[PDB]
Amino acid sequence: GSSGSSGKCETKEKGAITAKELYTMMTDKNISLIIMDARRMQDYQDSCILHSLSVPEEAISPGVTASWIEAHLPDDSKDTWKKRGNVEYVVLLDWFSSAKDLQIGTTLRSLKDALFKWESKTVLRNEPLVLEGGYENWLLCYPQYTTNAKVSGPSSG
């Protein structure tokens, strides 16, 4: 080579995490990591990953802060919520919304920006990443890592 000709490129992940990476960190004592499910309150009841956190979808608004979410969260989730600053890395979940399908209004986006971008006191080491596919894909990757595996989530049509 002389300088470096252009091409096309394929693998170009940006602000995204895979299920495989979550496992390596999920069972890591040296590396902390918390998982959150930005979905409806009913979704958490039907399906929910073990050793994971939960957060309503309505409670998370586009352009909110930590005080907002912290104000609207479960009783047991409120604990791990505060540990967000103690841990190192962070990850989220979803049904059909990846980091590429994120927009100005999505729960993941508003939650991803309301954890670092809209920070005042607590601060993390990196930026919140979204799992590849979310819970829908987590079942296909590791169905033996959730409280409820018998959960079907077909498409709109």
Alpha carbon distance 149, 47 (integer Å): 7
Token pair listed for 86? 């103690």
Q: How many residues does the chain have?
A: 157
Alpha carbon distance 110, 155 (integer Å): 24
Token pair listed for 157? 């049509």
Residue 155 lies in a domain: no
Residue 36 lies in a domain: yes
Beta-bridged to residue 35, according to DSSP, are 91
For residue 72, how far is the Cα from the chain centroid? 17
Residue 87 lies in a domain: yes
Contact in structure between 61 and 71 (CB atoms under 8 Å): no
* Secondary structure percentages of the chain, helix, strand, coil, to 5: 30, 15, 55
Q: For position 24, which CATH number holds?
A: 3.40.250.10
Total tally of structural domains belonging to the chain: 1
Domain of residue 46: give its range. 14-147
Method: NMR
Residue 156 lies in a domain: no
- Scanning the structure block, which residue is given the tokens 């409806």? 40
Alpha carbon distance 12, 53 (integer Å): 28
Beta-bridged to residue 16, according to DSSP, are 130
DSSP string, 24-78: HHHT-SSS-EEEEEES-HHHHHH--BTT-EEE-SSS--TT--HHHHHHS--TTHH
